[PDB]
């Protein structure tokens, strides 16, 4: 409600400034994916709409680490920008949430 | 024209195709050594 929108709306704009200030940062490390994943509405995304998706055997140039559940990085593709990469503990959290 | 069909139908098409493509692959395989003979 009104008491829940004071902190939820202030965290989306705070995470969007972190995403916008990380495109000029150099690439720290790249990862090689093994499974497929797509963004959904209930994945606890900080900025809903700026998430990226990856299929199996794709490449992700991770820029920095946002938190313990989401990374900041871009997809190796012509024209793609930075996005939210799920951490390996987030991929472990998304699989056990489907069973519970 | 009826004789080029009977030279199509004996064996003679490959002679100007294989030896053509055995020549252009010969000239191309020479560049893969001789461009490394210099630098």
């Amino acid at each position: 409600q009104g008491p829940h929108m004071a902190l939820r709306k202030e965290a989306e704009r705070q995470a969007l400034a972190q995403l916008e200030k990380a495109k000029t940062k150099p690439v720290a490390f790249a990862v090689r994916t093994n499974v497929g994943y797509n963004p959904s509405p209930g994945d606890e995304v900080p900025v809903e709409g700026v998430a990226i998706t990856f299929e199996p055997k794709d490449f992700l140039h991770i820029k920095e680490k946002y938190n313990n559940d989401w990374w900041i990085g871009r997809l190796v593709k012509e024209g793609c920008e930075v996005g939210f990469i799920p951490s390996p503990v987030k991929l472990d959290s998304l699989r056990l949430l489907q069973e519970q | 024209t009826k004789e080029r069909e009977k030279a199509k139908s004996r064996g003679t098409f490959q002679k100007l195709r294989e030896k053509q493509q055995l020549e252009e692959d010969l000239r191309g395989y020479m560049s893969w050594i001789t461009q490394g003979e210099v630098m």
Binding site: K23, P26, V27, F29, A30, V31, R32, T33, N34, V35, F59, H61, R74, V76, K77, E78, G79, C80, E81, P88, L91 | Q21, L22, E24, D25, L26, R27, G28, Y29, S31, W32, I33, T34, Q35, G36, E37, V38, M39
Partner: protein, 178 residues
């Protein structure tokens, strides 16, 4: 099973195995293919010579990992990496490490012309007739989609058109515009 594996930020370009390496044939047909790699991306490429077998992670573990971490240093400045390997002769040979190189395949389109290259290098290479094309037919037992870049163009300007435009399309994919 880990979903993510630590790979370098820039993949090393690997001119590997048209015929089997370690001869006057494949090495000096690959040595020619670093001459066009010398000045074409000059200033945005790192050309080195690979000596140790990097398919073990012979040489020990310390001498190989120090060369793998050297490739890790060359991907920090976001530039292209080229490897002059003399032992790599299959895509699956470099599928167990944490590098994932670009399997550039110099393609031999006709095996019958390959035994005539053996007769053209004198009588020194003529004693290695069937063993070279054997695993260079097991480089045909590989499916072609297991590679990354395949070069079947015979002329120099036609084979280097795929060599330059594919890495330029890969350069724009790794580096976004401002």
């Amino acid at each position: 099973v880990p979903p993510y594996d630590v790979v370098p930020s820039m993949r090393p370009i690997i001119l590997v195995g048209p015929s089997l390496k370690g001869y006057e044939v494949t090495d000096m047909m690959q040595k020619a293919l670093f001459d066009f790699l010398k000045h074409l991306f000059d200033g945005r490429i790192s050309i080195t010579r690979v000596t140790a077998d990097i398919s073990l992670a012979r040489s020990s573990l310390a001498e190989v990992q120090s060369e793998i971490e050297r490739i890790f240093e060359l991907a920090r400045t976001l530039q292209l990496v080229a490897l002059d390997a003399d032992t790599i002769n299959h895509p699956a040979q470099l599928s167990k490490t944490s590098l994932a190189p670009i399997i550039v395949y110099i393609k031999i389109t006709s095996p019958k012309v390959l035994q005539r290259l053996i007769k053209s290098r004198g009588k020194s290479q003529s004693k290695h007739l069937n063993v070279q094309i054997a695993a260079s037919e097991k480089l045909a037992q590989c499916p072609p989609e297991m590679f990354d870049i395949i070069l079947d163009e015979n002329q120099l300007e036609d084979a280097c058109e795929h060599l330059a435009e594919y890495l330029e399309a890969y350069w724009k994919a790794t580096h976004p515009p401002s």
